[PDB]
Design a protein around this ligand. Structure first.
Ligand SMILES: NC(=O)c1ccc[n+]([C@@H]2O[C@H](COP(=O)([O-])OP(=O)(O)OC[C@H]3O[C@@H](n4cnc5c(N)ncnc54)[C@H](OP(=O)(O)O)[C@@H]3O)[C@@H](O)[C@H]2O)c1
Ligand SMILES: C[C@]12CCC(=O)C=C1CC[C@@H]1[C@@H]2CC[C@]2(C)C(=O)CC[C@@H]12
Length: 316
């Protein structure tokens, strides 16, 4: 409903539902709850191994008449072991086959860190470092363009790119389509203000994940890291507005022109998150939240920090 117009003329709802949870179905149940609560933008990926269940949930809410297909904005992502140009369309077609849909609304390069092709999601060496691939990302992008022209994806964009990595695509000779979006880690402890200003200058929408502080998976999160939603400024703002620290975090993104994802597998929290549209943070609230920035990415593991194209080496 509240939507941004993408640089390709398509529209994306500003609030999105995060479908990923740790390997520990449930995806089916909570995705239907999300749609029932009012979410229209649904975020999945090959990586999540949940596209059958998320696709099922969406089609179920269309079949029962709750929504029409054109009312749902469905995103999947090309996994980093499928960057070689010849793998891209088959990876999209397989995503579509799993979801049982004709097209995705949005197909993303999940990460700028190409990995060796194969059946493993993150092939790693004896030293825990990912086995990386040298495929030119511009050729991956050209294959994404062809997926858009084939009608298999209404829009195409990227995820986890820094400014440099974005400029590589933007500066490609023969570029047909700019990415519509860059989906990146973004929250009050890592607000990406410089990258956000850059994206806006290029008509690229910044889409925030881990907007509620991440699920803190022991596999990649520093257990030392502060819990975002325990932040005392966020909790003081929540008390002032009679909302919750989660709502304060989501609303912050909306007011700075960031499209925001929120994962919840809890029925009460799913319904709560749609309340982000019900209230407004003041100019001073926003400045206070801006002051929380610690440049803190919660995804913080050697396995990927070792990768030559790790986006967090650059200033932004
Ligand atoms: N492109 C990428 O590389 C990338 C990376 C990470 C995530 N993502 C996407 O973004 C989505 C969200 O990111 P995220 O998974 O890191 O999670 P998140 O949205 O930051 O959520 C963190 C935790 O917040 C809790 N929560 C939700 N609403 C709450 C509320 N109102 N009050 C208190 N707690 C609340 C949830 O726990 P409960 O489930 O118990 O409510 C959830 O596990 C993912 O599911 C995925 O779709 C993409
Ligand atoms: C979640 C993830 C996937 C599969 C896996 O095995 C390990 C990780 C941890 C690091 C994540 C990566 C996805 C790519 C990320 C988001 C970036 O662009 C920087 C941090 C990096």
């Amino acid at each position: 409903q509240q939507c941004v117009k993408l640089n390709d003329g398509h529209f994306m709802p500003v609030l999105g539902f995060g479908t990923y949870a740790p390997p520990e179905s449930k995806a089916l149940e909570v995705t239907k709850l999300a749609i029932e609560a009012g979410f229209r933008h649904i975020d999945s990926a090959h990586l999540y191994n949940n596209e059958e269940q998320v696709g099922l949930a969406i089609r179920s809410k269309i079949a029962d008449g709750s929504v029409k297909r054109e009312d749902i904005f469905y995103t999947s992502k090309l996994w980093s072991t499928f960057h070689r140009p010849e793998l891209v369309r088959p990876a999209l077609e397989n995503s579509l086959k799993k979801a049982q849909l004709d097209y995705v609304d949005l197909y993303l390069i999940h990460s700028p860190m190409s990995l060796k092709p194969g059946e493993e999601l993150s092939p790693t060496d004896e030293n825990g470092k990912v086995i990386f691939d040298i495929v030119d990302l511009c050729t991956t992008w050209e294959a994404m363009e062809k997926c858009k022209d084939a009608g298999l994806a209404k829009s195409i964009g990227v995820s986890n790119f820094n400014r440099r990595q974005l400029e590589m695509i933007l500066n490609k000779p023969g570029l047909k389509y700019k990415p519509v979006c860059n989906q990146v880690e973004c929250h009050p402890y890592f607000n990406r203000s410089k990258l956000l200003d850059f994206c806006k200058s290029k008509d690229i929408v910044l889409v925030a994940y881990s907007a509620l502080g991440s699920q803190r998976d022991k596999r990649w999160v520093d257990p030392n890291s502060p819990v975002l939603l325990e932040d005392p400024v966020l909790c003081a703002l929540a008390k002032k507005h009679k909302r919750t620290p989660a709502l304060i975090a989501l609303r912050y993104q909306l007011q700075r022109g960031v499209v925001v994802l929120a994962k919840s597998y809890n029925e009460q929290r799913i319904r709560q998150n749609v309340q982000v549209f019900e209230f407004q943070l003041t100019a001073e609230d926003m400045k206070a939240i801006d002051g929380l920035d610690r440049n803190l990415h919660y995804f913080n593991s050697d396995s990927f920090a070792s990768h030559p194209n790790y986006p967090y080496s650059d200033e932004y």
